[PDB]
Design a protein around this ligand. Structure first.
Ligand SMILES: Nc1nc2c(ncn2[C@@H]2O[C@H](COP(=O)(O)OP(=O)(O)NP(=O)(O)O)[C@@H](O)[C@H]2O)c(=O)[nH]1
Ligand SMILES: [Ca+2]
Ligand SMILES: [Mg+2]
Ligand SMILES: [Mg+2]
Length: 166
């Protein structure tokens, strides 16, 4: 049974925890409790393969930026999340990508760019703007709503499929 070490990263409040909890526990967290560092594990079948997802849900609140180097070393794939109603969170993605990129000493780290909260109408990050960022990384862009579950399984499973291309 393959184990996949996924790490969810991004700015505070973008929905990292709500996405992970929707995937693992199938409900929507309406309240905002800032995360330090939590882990989840679940056995799932992906493309006929039983595997174990080990998901690290990280802090976006800039206090715990010191713990970033630790988890960027352990993780095999990174879900890089911003919120489509938060332009600053989109601009912050670089800081996360470069950090992963620097820490891993690799321009070839399994990653997926996630535009979350696509159920909200106050969009300030257009899909094409995020597609361009993902293209320069050579990674997929996927929009999600942790609230409606739109795209949630697709985002995490796509990251597993990125790890599998090595
Ligand atoms: N409408 C909507 N709200 C969402 C969505 N995802 C998260 N939220 C809301 O946004 C707030 C923050 O979500 P949360 O998952 O805690 O964010 P986070 O990125 O884990 N924060 P932190 O980095 O501090 O741990 C919560 O009120 C949550 O309900 C989404 O897809 N749609
Ligand atoms: Ca709820
Ligand atoms: Mg959180
Ligand atoms: Mg604009």
């Amino acid at each position: 049974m393959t184990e996949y070490k996924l790490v969810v990263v991004g700015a505070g409040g973008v929905g990292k925890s709500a996405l992970t909890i929707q995937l693992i526990q199938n409900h929507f967290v309406d309240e905002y409790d800032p995360t330090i560092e939590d882990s989840y594990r679940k056995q799932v079948v992906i493309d006929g393969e039983t595997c174990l997802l080990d998901i690290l849900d990280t802090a976006g609140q800039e206090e715990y930026s010191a713990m970033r180097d630790q988890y960027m070393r352990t993780g095999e794939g990174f879900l890089c999340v911003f919120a489509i109603n938060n332009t600053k969170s989109f601009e912050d993605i670089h800081q996360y990508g470069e950090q992963i990129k620097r820490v891993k000493d690799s321009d070839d780290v399994p990653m997926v760019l996630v535009g979350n909260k696509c159920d909200l109408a106050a969009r300030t990050v257009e899909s094409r703007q995020a597609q361009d960022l993902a293209r320069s990384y050579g990674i997929p862009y996927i929009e999600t709503s942790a609230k409606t579950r739109q795209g949630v399984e697709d985002a995490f499973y796509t990251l597993v499929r990125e790890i599998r291309q090595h």
